[PDB]
Design a protein around this nucleic acid. Structure first.
Ligand SMILES: CN[C@@H]1[C@@H](O)[C@@H](O[C@@H]2[C@@H](O)[C@H](O[C@H]3O[C@H]([C@@H](C)O)[C@@H](O)[C@H](O)[C@H]3N)[C@@H](N)C[C@H]2N)OC[C@]1(C)O
Lengths: 132, 143, 58, 178
RNA sequence: AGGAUAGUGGCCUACCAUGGUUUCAACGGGUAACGGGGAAUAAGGGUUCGAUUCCGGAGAGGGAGCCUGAGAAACGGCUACCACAUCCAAGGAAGGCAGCAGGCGCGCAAAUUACCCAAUCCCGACACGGGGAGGUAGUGACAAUAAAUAACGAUACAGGUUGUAAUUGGAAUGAGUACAAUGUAAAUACCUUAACGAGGAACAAUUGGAGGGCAAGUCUGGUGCCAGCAG
């Protein structure tokens, strides 16, 4: 309860269609403050929408209380989708996880494909008439 | 006077003279001949391993009278045979013929120690376990 | 009056075994330094320059 | 690979391990200031030796030498801001008279039992370790934390400790059940 | 003078001259020699170390020869021989971990056949793809920093105003565990933290010593120049 938020070292970034700042949080008698709650409170303070708010890298001070981090307010939501890495959007629920096998499986697959000159159809038919 | 040249252009004579006479110092001569690499039983290593060939008792030198328990050891790296003291009361019964021992120096960098003549090494481990552990019953002899 | 390899471990093997006596633990760290300081420089036992740290009970 | 990170040793053991007079001196210092081992005396000896060396090297120079005027005054500033020197000994000559107790007096533990927050210096160290002490509004659990002259008046208890406005520890919360 | 080279040059060829280096150490031999930036010690002068986070060189089992290409005498390119080593239907075919991990060997002597391109940065036709380069974790007492293993009362004591004693209580807490959030590419850990988490606070500190050098017993039992200790 009674979570105070402050910003310092503010940079406006038209180049990335956003605004950059460092977040300072005062939360007595509470472990820390969730990133989604911080995002909503920031959206409320700056009357912006939540899906255009970014928070990352939060570090509680020694003993407790004061925490710090970084904040990004994109001037829209399409700009958020366009200048935001996939993992942060996955954290926010905005984007889905790209589906793929383990890295070793992908590499083994790639090294099997280098064995074939042409298409898979020709190799499959040649193997078929090669066996039976 | 002083028997050494003092001329300001005599650096060659001074440096060569020092180089010649440094051969009279044992440590310099040993490290430039490479005697540890060529003639030391351990080949310059701090420790070495070997197979026990036999148990031997060595008479302590005067004015002491005792039997210092030692083992004759054949080293693995070079096949050399050395004698190592097995230090503590009853620790000879822990080592047996054909066992593998770890040897270390005996404290005086290639010299014998105390009243034990001709012994320059000591047993540290037998069968992969230290003698200090076995003597104190902190471990067990493997089998 | 000779020794032999057969006599190895004589005195230790024939030493009468005595178990440790159960005693309280000794404080560790700063408490031990406190204790030694109190022994030597607080509760003094000096008498005309006789300050044995380990006198024999007698 | 990444560049190597520097690291150094902060103490040095004595050259003679068994001089009885200095052994008694170290035991007295540890007992007076509630230290844990002899290495804590060795560290302050290390710091004092290097400070005196720096002062001596600067004092080989003339009062008009610019290197003295810069480095000696920086050294004086650091010493007078941590509490080792007062506002009347800024000449590098009083830098040579500093003793281990001068730094021992400026520790967190010493000042905690001096102010009155604890009875014995051992109890002071024990409070510091259990995070009951805050410098400013920052909890400090380091007894070798050296307080500066403009930090002495802000030492007090932590707001979350049972000694400065907090709740009860597990012992009292179990012992209040009945 | 020519040839060759990207180009100079005995670099090579033809003709010609007889020169070139050396006790101010040539030439030869050894190096358990890659060089330097640097490291330890350090009154000064010195002595010793530097395979190894950066810079330069060299190599890819050993030699040699090449294609391609701006650039290689390239080896995760080719050709041959030597040595190793693989499959086979016996005709033939396929190789190069001094890259990461892992195995055998060797030895006194050194970690996982893990996760990932999020960061540093490089490559490509490229804002998108790839990267054991790199980063993350596992192992890890190499070395280094900080820093627990207890703190405070009252009774009976006692001392000469508290320096000293057992048995009498209440607190304090982090090691550990675990919601949670945070941390992260996802984790793990740290840090914050709900509920737990101390009387033998058994949640119990060890390693070496106690004749001298050198700090700390002539206390007790055992052995009797034996067993053992002892730089
Ligand atoms: C076999 N042991 C040799 C021992 O004989 C001696 O060697 C000297 C050697 O030092 C002398 O050589 C020395 O002195 C000459 C000086 C005369 O000009 C110097 O020029 C030379 O550099 C120097 N090494 C050499 N001329 C004779 C050997 N016997 O000292 C070196 C040594 C290795 O110990």
């Amino acid at each position: 309860d009674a979570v105070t938020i402050r910003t310092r070292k503010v940079i406006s970034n038209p180049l990335l269609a956003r605004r950059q700042f460092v977040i300072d949080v005062l939360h007595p008698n509470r472990a820390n403050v969730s990133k989604d709650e911080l995002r909503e409170k920031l959206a409320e303070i700056y009357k912006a929408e939540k899906d255009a708010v970014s928070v990352f890298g939060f570090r509680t001070q020694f003993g407790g209380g004061k925490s710090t981090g970084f904040g990004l307010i994109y001037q829209s939501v399409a700009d958020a989708k366009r200048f935001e890495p996939a993992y942060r959007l996955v954290r926010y629920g905005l984007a889905e996880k790209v589906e793929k096998a383990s890295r070793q499986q992908r590499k083994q697959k790639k090294n099997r494909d280098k064995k074939i000159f042409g298409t898979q159809r020709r190799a499959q038919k040649r193997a078929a008439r090669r066996n039976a | 006077g002083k028997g050494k040249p003092r001329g300001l252009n005599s650096a060659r004579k001074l440096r060569v003279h020092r180089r010649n006479n440094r051969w009279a110092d044992q440590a310099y001569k040993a490290r430039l001949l490479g005697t540890a690499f060529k003639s030391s039983p351990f080949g310059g290593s701090s420790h070495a391993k070997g197979i026990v060939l036999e148990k031997i008792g060595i008479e302590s030198k005067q004015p002491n009278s005792a039997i210092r328990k030692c083992v004759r050891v054949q080293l693995i790296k070079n096949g050399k045979k050395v004698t190592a003291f097995v230090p503590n009361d009853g620790c000879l019964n822990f080592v047996d013929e054909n066992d593998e021992v770890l040897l270390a120096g005996f404290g005086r960098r290639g010299k014998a120690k105390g009243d034990i003549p001709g012994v320059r090494f000591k047993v540290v481990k037998v069968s992969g376990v230290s003698l200090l552990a076995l003597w104190k019953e902190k471990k067990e002899k493997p089998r | 009056v000779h020794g032999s390899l057969a006599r190895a471990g004589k005195v230790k093997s024939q030493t009468p075994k005595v178990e440790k006596q159960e005693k309280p633990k000794k404080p560790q760290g700063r408490a031990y330094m406190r204790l030694l300081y109190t022994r030597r420089f607080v509760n003094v036992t000096l008498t005309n320059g006789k300050r044995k740290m380990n006198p024999s009970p007698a | 690979p990444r560049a190597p990170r520097t690291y150094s040793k902060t103490y040095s053991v004595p050259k003679r391990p068994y001089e009885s007079a200095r052994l008694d001196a170290e035991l007295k210092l540890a007992g007076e200031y509630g230290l844990k081992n002899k290495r804590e005396i060795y560290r302050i000896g290390f710091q004092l030796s290097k400070i005196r060396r720096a002062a001596r090297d600067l004092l080989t120079r003339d009062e008009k030498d610019p290197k003295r005027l810069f480095e000696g005054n920086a050294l004086i500033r650091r010493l007078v801001r941590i509490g080792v020197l007062s506002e009347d000994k800024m000449k590098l000559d009083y830098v040579l008279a500093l003793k281990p107790e001068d730094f021992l007096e400026r520790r967190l533990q010493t000042q905690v039992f001096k102010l009155g927050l604890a009875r014995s210096i051992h109890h002071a160290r024990v409070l510091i370790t259990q995070r009951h002490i805050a410098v400013g509004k920052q909890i400090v659990n380091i007894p070798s934390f050296t307080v500066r002259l403009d930090s002495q008046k802000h030492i007090d208890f932590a707001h979350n400790s049972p000694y400065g406005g907090g709740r009860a520890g597990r012992v009292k919360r179990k012992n209040q059940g009945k």
